[PDB]
A = this chain, B = another copy of it.
Amino acid sequence: IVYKPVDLSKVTSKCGSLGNIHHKPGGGQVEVKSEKLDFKDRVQSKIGSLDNITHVPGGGNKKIETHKLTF
């Protein structure tokens, strides 16, 4: 005759760099000489003293719920 589903729950996802301290995380010196090169097809290149990434394609949630009462 009576029902009362009580949901007080918590769903949580904490993803990537969080709550951190980085103190003096210095990238060093970088040098890239290059002489008499040929590249007769596609190239991609990346050069850097410091790189720092949080990517996080994940971290997703789904909460799914159902009720019925039937005579």
Contacts and interface: CB of A to CB of B under 8 A. Distances in A.
Interface SS of chain A: strand
For this complex, into which size category does the number of interface residues on chain A fall? Answer: 35 or more
A50 B25 CA distance: 9
B44 A43 contact: yes
Given A5-B4, A53-B52, A30 B33 contact: no
A10 B7 contact: no
A11 B56 CA distance: 18
B19 A19 contact: yes
10 contacts: A12-B61, A15-B15, A24-B26, A38-B38, A40-B57, A42-B43, A46-B47, A57-B57, A57-B58, A71-B71
